[PDB]
Amino acid sequence: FSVIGNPFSKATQQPQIPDGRMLESLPRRCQLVTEIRNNVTVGSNPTYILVAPSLGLAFQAYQDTNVPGGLDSSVYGLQNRGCTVRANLSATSIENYNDIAKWRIVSQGINLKLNNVEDENDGWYEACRFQHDWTPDELCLRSTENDASTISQDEDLVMGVISSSFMNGALNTIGNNMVEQRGYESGLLKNIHKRMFQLHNNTSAIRPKTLQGQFNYGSEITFSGTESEARFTDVPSNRQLVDSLWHNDYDCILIKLYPRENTGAAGQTGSALIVNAIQNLELQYSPTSDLSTYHIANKRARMVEAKL
Amino acid sequence: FSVIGNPFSKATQQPQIPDGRMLESLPRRCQLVTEIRNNVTVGSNPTYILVAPSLGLAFQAYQDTNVPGGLDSSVYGLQNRGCTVRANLSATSIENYNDIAKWRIVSQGINLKLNNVEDENDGWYEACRFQHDWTPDELCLRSTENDASTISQDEDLVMGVISSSFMNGALNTIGNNMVEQRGYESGLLKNIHKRMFQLHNNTSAIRPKTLQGQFNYGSEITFSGTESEARFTDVPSNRQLVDSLWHNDYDCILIKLYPRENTGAAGQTGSALIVNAIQNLELQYSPTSDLSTYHIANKRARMVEAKL
Amino acid sequence: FSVIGNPFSKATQQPQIPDGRMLESLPRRCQLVTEIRNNVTVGSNPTYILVAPSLGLAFQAYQDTNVPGGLDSSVYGLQNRGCTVRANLSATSIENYNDIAKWRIVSQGINLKLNNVEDENDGWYEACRFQHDWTPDELCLRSTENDASTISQDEDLVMGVISSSFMNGALNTIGNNMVEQRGYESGLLKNIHKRMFQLHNNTSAIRPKTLQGQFNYGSEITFSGTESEARFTDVPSNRQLVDSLWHNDYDCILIKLYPRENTGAAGQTGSALIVNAIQNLELQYSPTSDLSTYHIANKRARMVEAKL
Amino acid sequence: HSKHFSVIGNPFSKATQQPQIPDGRMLESLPRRCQLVTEIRNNVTVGSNPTYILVAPSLGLAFQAYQDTNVPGGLDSSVYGLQNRGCTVRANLSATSIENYNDIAKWRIVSQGINLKLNNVEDENDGWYEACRFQHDWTPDELCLRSTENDASTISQDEDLVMGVISSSFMNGALNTIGNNMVEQRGYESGLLKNIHKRMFQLHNNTSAIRPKTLQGQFNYGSEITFSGTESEARFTDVPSNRQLVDSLWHNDYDCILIKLYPRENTGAAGQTGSALIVNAIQNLELQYSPTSDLSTYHIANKRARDAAGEPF
Amino acid sequence: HSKHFSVIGNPFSKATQQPQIPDGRMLESLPRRCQLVTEIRNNVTVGSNPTYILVAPSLGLAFQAYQDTNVPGGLDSSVYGLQNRGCTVRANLSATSIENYNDIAKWRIVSQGINLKLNNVEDENDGWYEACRFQHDWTPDELCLRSTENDASTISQDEDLVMGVISSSFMNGALNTIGNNMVEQRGYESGLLKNIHKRMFQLHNNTSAIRPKTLQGQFNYGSEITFSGTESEARFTDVPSNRQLVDSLWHNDYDCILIKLYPRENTGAAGQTGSALIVNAIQNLELQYSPTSDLSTYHIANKRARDAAGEPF
Amino acid sequence: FSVIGNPFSKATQQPQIPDGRMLESLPRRCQLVTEIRNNVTVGSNPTYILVAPSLGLAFQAYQDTNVPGGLDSSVYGLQNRGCTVRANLSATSIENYNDIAKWRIVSQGINLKLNNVEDENDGWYEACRFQHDWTPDELCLRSTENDASTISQDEDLVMGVISSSFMNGALNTIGNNMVEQRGYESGLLKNIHKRMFQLHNNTSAIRPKTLQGQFNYGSEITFSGTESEARFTDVPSNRQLVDSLWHNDYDCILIKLYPRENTGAAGQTGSALIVNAIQNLELQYSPTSDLSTYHIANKRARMVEAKL
After folding, report:
1. Is the Cβ–Cβ distance between F185 and F196 less than 8 Å?
2. A150 at the D interface (CB within 8 A)?
3. Which of A74, C38, C295, F136 is exposed most, by the fewest CB atoms within 10 A?
């Protein structure tokens, strides 16, 4: 093993990384397909898609028509496939209810197809991968619902970037220096369909991350009063959380989009993109912790029948 | 291939039947370990352990200390492994809520170990396999809970024999004529730990049974007012239900026990048996019918963001 | 390499892991042999033996006759082999006075032998291994003394589970669902002498845990006023202590016991088990921190003799 | 990969200006050879007490010397750090953080070592030494942050910093204990200073699987880092944040080297001004840089190839 | 020296990653290829008035665009500067100086150019353009300092800066005059935007003896540099200090290129959102660094070797 | 095996003597490095270093600046490495507290380097080995502290020669006839650094010496009232002690030094010598006798918990 493969392989793909670092592991194929469209607010400015090694995040899209309330980006989670954590507000913790003890990524990627008619097929794009020295205050917890309301009890969560990274943070800086980055490419959106974007591991010895059954937090995690987001300060507890849900043995991908403008009128409705995102996981599960559905019967025999 | 294998064998245990009769099937190992003991009312009469090719049933035991309320047999089920149907009383139907489209058995059987002290280790047994021509009025539905209440909404069910079969029905008749039956053996209970009893198929072309998502019934299924059992009359509908939960391509196993008497007193508390039932299944699943815990977002991009 | 070996095997017992991950390491064999018995308060309820990859712990037993004061479990440690840390209460720190810089396990496990007379040799057990996603509030510090006094200065400590885990926590939940777990086995206690239980590593690249010479703690570690136990809250510091005393590259072993009842009377004094725990360690040592018993002469020759 | 193996182990080696460990654990990393030359001379205040040189795997630190003639202000040891070389962090006191201003994402040490040469006239060329390597179990309150400037002023805004040990460790802490019990340490060697130029003291790895340490862009600190009001020193308490910082700046996959020196005394009298050693420390690093960094564009693919204190320099 | 000649004149040239002018005027210098890709689209507020692209020999500036869709706040032009690349100065407002933080001692331009490609659908692919090169006699009050960030905030501490022209120069200053009299300018060319991808616009030198400009570590300024309270812009008066700063940041041995654009109007209506150009600016620099700098160690010996706006891209 | 090797071998050294005379033995590497200097009292007369096969004695140096009180020689012990006995004055015995049952010597030697500036590098030396018929009244017990006070409780002891042997006893006689002895050499001190002096065994069948746990003594051992020394008469008890701590299967080495004079003034401060002494032992250990630190727990289970 040197480099992780391509999730969109017509060939046959290895379910796991064959290195002996996760014995008796199980593979989990997580896939999301949906159409996204650049919103009206962003006007003529470029939009962005970020693919990160974050557990259960299919991708994060800057300024698309799905953005909730006042947040400026959308997240697309894989919470239906059983690879996310949720919010246990009554116990004030991040709950690992899918019983994942250890996880890594076998392959992760994205493929976009322009869904626009022939006389609206303009636009172009730049893409690149990058290894960034993330600080926790650049990251945040987002509800996978991607909705306009506060995070509530048992809400599924993914780790993404604060939306402002795209406009004046790290991702903007990278977004403006794309042509100097590793693995740079550019093209017309009408051609992006023939492009499989895949994450690259930055080491050949990929060690899994560990999750606790409950990850307790104090005031260093600020849950937003109106939006479906929670912010981090940079304190020891939040670094440990970032170390459990973000896999820094993998680089990220940034796609910068220069789409056809969306003014919300016929003929000018943006660049619709069919997005196909896959995150192939390798998991070691802990024992089931919720047996509320199970019938647990006493294994010791009664001395005498309950009849007498 | 010709004959199914031994579920307890530690030698290259096939997860499927390599006959090509179930393409893209999945295996399912369901194991139950528990202790049982003959009760006081049976007295010095024989007791029985039935192992049958019924979906989800580990074994049925006649007159052990666990018999619920006024029933004379105990059912032991594998509901925790998702291989059962449940009572949908509000729709008056048997609900295949685990979405099993088709099933057959790969291997099944029990191993028994005597758990008495050495000065109480008497007793003996007779064992055979057979291919009874079952009629639906000899069978019944039983709540896997094995409790002394009535069958409720969404209660898990297994198909077993009516308890009076062991006393004055087909099983008693077979139990009285064991040497005529195939696979006859006998021995002392203190040596039964050496026997790996296993079901046999009566054909080398085992075709899977089919299940509907709902199996609606009328008055032909009578639910006990007081017991955790529902009875059948011999009518076309009940025959069709029997055909989907009882794989008649396999033979049953009857173990007749002549144990130490349970009178309730010291040194006369019966023969305790540690039972190790296993049912290995080959399943074709049907698509998830219940998505009440899924997140289903519209896959078409909004034309405009919600905040406009 | 792939998997660690059997500590009880009499066949070319490797003293190290031949992976090159601990250069100039030293081996350390730590063995404890003792007898245990279920107590009277547990009554006819199951008891447990936990074997965990905790530094210096032979095993933890739930509800045996040795339980100290008001605790419900007994810890058995290998302090006499110099593989433990101790309480430095006057510095409010956990003291690595044995100068272990880095550690991993080469092999570990237990062998149990029933020590009852033949007319009292009933009982049975279930055993499995698992990879729980431990949280620090499920764990605790325990004085290896296993006595009914409070933790004193320089008292030897091992990390074990809180006793209430066996009753209403993760271990009870695992204990109720053993067949779902890996390595499941069951049997009679009178035959358990034939089983060499052994920990498994969940990765072929076992990286050593690190230890500081002092590990200072604040209020997040609460020392019992009356018991030989200290408890944790789930905070960054406790997580960091857990990471240094509990090697999570290994799985734990739970043995659930259904023994003869101990009522205190003649012939009803429980099931006595002779336990043979072994923990083989690979250690990198740090230079002797305590030279209070050394002779340290000045290495520079005096210019003149003292008598002048 | 031959030149890489020549540099690996042997820091004093002009085989390749791009040394990397070819184990596949840092794909497309960037080599960095940092070299320093200086003079170590025992100062007057240490008298006849032994002096020390510590070589530790700390990032950007060539070595640390106890009671030499460069000790600043009230501190008893000198740090010799590699500054203006792209491998140091700095003190963002305004934001109250330790800033990774070169944006190093991941880093490890390909090799590290020193060579010492006595330069006293032959009528003043006495003194001897012992040396050892060890694998101490560090606690953060034994470590500290030092301005690479090694000057007699408080740490100011944007000051370059390296991790060192607190000076008193040499007097009454871990390093005093190791120095007093040198013979029992691994790789023990002893000799005369007039011959010490024959030796090359290199750090050794304690594992064959050396994993890079990670760094954030900003590492925010609270009151657990106490900046001196007078010295160029910041001290730690043993709390989780300081353990995280030590993990990010002190690579614990390597051992330390300690050299204990019994030099010719420095008194000030005519021929009695100590022992002068010309020192030639080298630290060969492997870095991964974050795209925002200047040195990002110089990344180079690195693909997998298939116990004594001193060696003959 | 063949690859150097290939890059010299022809910035879009993958001949060598180390381009230098082999005239002997910069011994042992360091090449630096800085590249930028962006989109230029005329914004709604300019209406049908012509837009512009200015390519000037300013240090770290790829180009400047008038009334495109990236104009920040109240400014009418956008600067596209090359940041985080080792060739920019920054705003040391605390010390009230312009800081040469990369420590460039001497610098000149080996070559510089742009290529533009229209990306509108064929039913919206109208518009035309004119282009010329010129050798304007600049005055400092026509120039200004712009944060490379091109953002809508005041210039803050440690902000990266490039020299540009004041935005109003396009409306009523020198650049308006040149744009109104393009046909009389040297190298005059005109064409359709759908064909503009065939052209490569490179700067040309006005002398064969190109002498590097010099920079100080700190360039202290008084009240003659007025920082905007709102915009990311600082303006000059025509005083000696500002002339010295302009000399150090604007290389007057090269000519400027001005492209005047008559694009498809951007109104917001469905098919009427302007002309979108994919732009590919490149600036190939020759630097001498001061020893304190990080990039000092990469210096390479450079020993002597022995008129139309566009060329066929 | 014929002759014992050189402890300063750049080559690889045998940890034990491979002859089968000490099965399951353990090797112990004992090393001492220190600077010595001839004192002022001895003036211009020669000084001496003796290396003997005495357990834990690195060497004995006649008239160096470290001599304690009125004794005329210093001893340098290896008591930090666990190969010495101590003084149990309360029980009036020599105590074998390191639990050594049997010991011999694998290799033992010394290497001296002149630490003097260029214009003070004069001096010379003669060296030789000898087999002497020691009488016990030529030997003595010395405190390894080499200090100016009486031997006290638990003082570490080594066996050396009475200091007067050097001036008018056996060693003086040998010291004056060096050039006729076996293995004679002479040279200048400025050259002694390139000389590895090693003991020679006088037999190829080296049998270990035995030590008692306590060696009791009467009045035949006279402890000095002011100095750290105890003298022997020649009686049966003292011969047995000399037979336990002095290994007459090995010869001794005498180095006679003619050093630069030390008058305690600048320019004339003697000949400083860096001494490197190694005594490689082969040991068979008895069981640990002091368990004061151990936690000895009753191995028999309680009938009932201490709680009831």
Report:
1. no
2. no
3. C295
